[PDB]
Amino acid sequence: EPCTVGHRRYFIFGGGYVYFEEYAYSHQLSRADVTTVSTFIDLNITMLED
Amino acid sequence: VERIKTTSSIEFARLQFTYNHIQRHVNDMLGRIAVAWCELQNHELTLWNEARKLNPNAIASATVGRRASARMLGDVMAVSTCVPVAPDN
Amino acid sequence: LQNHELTLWNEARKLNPNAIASATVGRRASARMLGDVMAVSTCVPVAPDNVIVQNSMRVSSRPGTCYSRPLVSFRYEDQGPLIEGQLGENNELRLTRDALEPCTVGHRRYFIFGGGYVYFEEYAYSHQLSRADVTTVSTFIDLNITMLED
Amino acid sequence: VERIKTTSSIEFARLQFTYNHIQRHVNDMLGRIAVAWCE
Amino acid sequence: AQFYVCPPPTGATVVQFEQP
Numbered sequence: 001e002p003c004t005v006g007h008r009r010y011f012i013f014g015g016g017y018v019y020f021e022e023y024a025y026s027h028q029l030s031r032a033d034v035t036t037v038s039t040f041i042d043l044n045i046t047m048l049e050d
Numbered sequence: 051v052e053r054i055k056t057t058s059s060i061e062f063a064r065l066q067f068t069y070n071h072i073q074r075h076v077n078d079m080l081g082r083i084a085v086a087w088c089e090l091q092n093h094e095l096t097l098w099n100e101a102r103k104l105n106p107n108a109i110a111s112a113t114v115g116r117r118a119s120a121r122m123l124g125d126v127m128a129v130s131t132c133v134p135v136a137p138d139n
Numbered sequence: 140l141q142n143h144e145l146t147l148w149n150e151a152r153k154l155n156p157n158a159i160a161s162a163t164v165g166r167r168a169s170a171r172m173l174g175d176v177m178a179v180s181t182c183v184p185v186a187p188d189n190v191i192v193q194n195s196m197r198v199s200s201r202p203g204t205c206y207s208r209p210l211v212s213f214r215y216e217d218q219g220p221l222i223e224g225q226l227g228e229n230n231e232l233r234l235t236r237d238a239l240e241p242c243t244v245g246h247r248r249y250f251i252f253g254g255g256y257v258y259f260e261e262y263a264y265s266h267q268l269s270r271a272d273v274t275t276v277s278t279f280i281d282l283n284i285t286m287l288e289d
Numbered sequence: 290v291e292r293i294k295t296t297s298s299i300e301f302a303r304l305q306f307t308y309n310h311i312q313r314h315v316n317d318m319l320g321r322i323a324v325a326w327c328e
Numbered sequence: 329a330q331f332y333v334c335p336p337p338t339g340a341t342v343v344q345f346e347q348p
Contacts, residue, residue, distance in 0.1 A: 009174035017176065034176060037163045039148045040141040041093055043086040048075050061300045069307055073287040076311075080318055084284040087325065091279040092348040096162040097147055098278045099345065100154045107334070113276040114343065119334030124208075124248035125228065126256065126273060126344045132334035247339040270347075277346040282325040287314050 010034075102127065152177055158229065185232065187253045189214045192226070194264040197242065205242045205262055208233070209250060226250055249273075 003023055010017045010029070017029040102109045103122065110120035110129050120127040152159040153172065160170035160179045170179040193210035209226045225233045229251055242262060249256045255269045 010176040012175040020174075037160075039093075039145055039163050041086050041089045044082060045079055048072075059300075061303070065303055065307055069311070072311055073289070076315065076318075077286040080284045080286065083322065084282060087280075087282045093162065094144075095278055095345065095348055096158055097144075097151050099158065100151050102345070104154070110276075110343070113278055113345070117332045117334075119337050120343075121337040123339060123342060124259075125251045126249040126342055128337045128339050128342050130335055130337045130341060132332040135331040135333050137329055137331055249342065270344075273342050273344050275346045276343045279346060280325050280328045282321060284318055284321065287311075 155228075157231070183215070185213055185215065189217075190232075192252065192257060192264065196259060196262045198239075201239075203242060204239050206236065207238045207240045209252075209257065209259065209264075210236070226252065 005022075007020070007022045009020045011020070013028070016031045017034065019026045019029050098109065098113075106120035106122055106127055107118075110127055111117050114129060117132045118129040119132055120129045122128075148159065148163075152170075156170035156172055156177050157168075160177060161167050164179060167182050167184075168179045169182050170177050172178075190211055190213040193212070196206040196209055198205050206225060210223070211226050211232065212221050212223050213232055214221055222234075223236075225236050225238060227233045230253070244261070246259070246261050248259045250259070252267070255267060256273065257267055258265045
């Protein structure tokens with residue numbers, strides 16, 4: 001791609017992310033650190049007690 | 051001043067308890083299922099909006115119920131019924 | 140099912156991160172992909188009575204090439220200035236008029252505007268209309284669950 | 290020509306009614322759920 | 329096991345999706 005100023009990117013690496021700034025490595029990062037938005041719909045089904 | 055007469059069968063009250071317990075649990079769980087189903091449909095509408103842009107014909111055929119040809123008119127689809135043709139022809 | 144449908148979602152955010160982020164986050168936000176993760180930012184509400192739609196999508200200075208989306212002018216407040224732009228997807232305002240396409244005959248388009256649609260005919264304003272004016276097909280699977288009567 | 294002997298406990302029939310009612314509702318609702326899931 | 333031929337769509341018939 002043609003290089004662009006202001007290149008900030010995250011890439012899935014191993015079990016976490018790797019963050020690059022301006023087409024250069026910046027730092028590793030844990031997956032739990034980036035805030036998570038849930039795409040799942042919760043359904044709480046509980047059983048009848050004996 | 052009166053004397054109260056008591057029935058000899060408590061089984062009606064125990065049946066009431068059992069029915070209330072089962073009914074309450076069933077209504078709670080089915081209510082949760084219904085709410086979750088509603089949220090799921092509202093959630094999937096977003097995917098449908100994008101698959102419509104991707105391939106209008108299949109999305110229109112699925113939603114309308116008939117094999118139709120669709121093309122986007124900006125933010126909405128225009129559809130037209132397709133003429134059947136026998137395979138041997 | 141959820142663990143399955145996530146496979147679809149990971150693709151949809153590549154098509155239109157705006158709608159996906161607005162649906163999942165819960166707020167109407169603007170998002171763009173940053174590789175394998177999506178960066179979002181809140182969008183500022185604007186009242187529907189402060190927006191005006193221009194009649195023509197053609198460009199008086201550029202023949203042959205013309206806007207694919209209507210031009211609009213909006214004001215953040217009553218004492219603010221007039222800010223020009225073009226309409227986007229699902230009540231979206233674009234500051235840059237970079238949506239250009241070759242002009243084609245038989246150009247009839249509907250665009251979401253306010254609570255209804257705005258219809259343009261050969262790159263020119265035709266009329267406003269309501270949501271109920273267009274027949275609707277449902278993507279919802281009905282599930283009619285009723286409770287036990289006491 | 291014979292005499293009908295009647296049981297002293299109607300609770301079997303009340304249990305039958307309650308079970309039938311619960312069964313009917315559950316079978317209706319879960320059947321609806323199955324159809325909706327398939328669709 | 330049946331084919332369909334689809335004429336090009338026109339603006340005469342327009343359908344949208346039901347809102348949430």
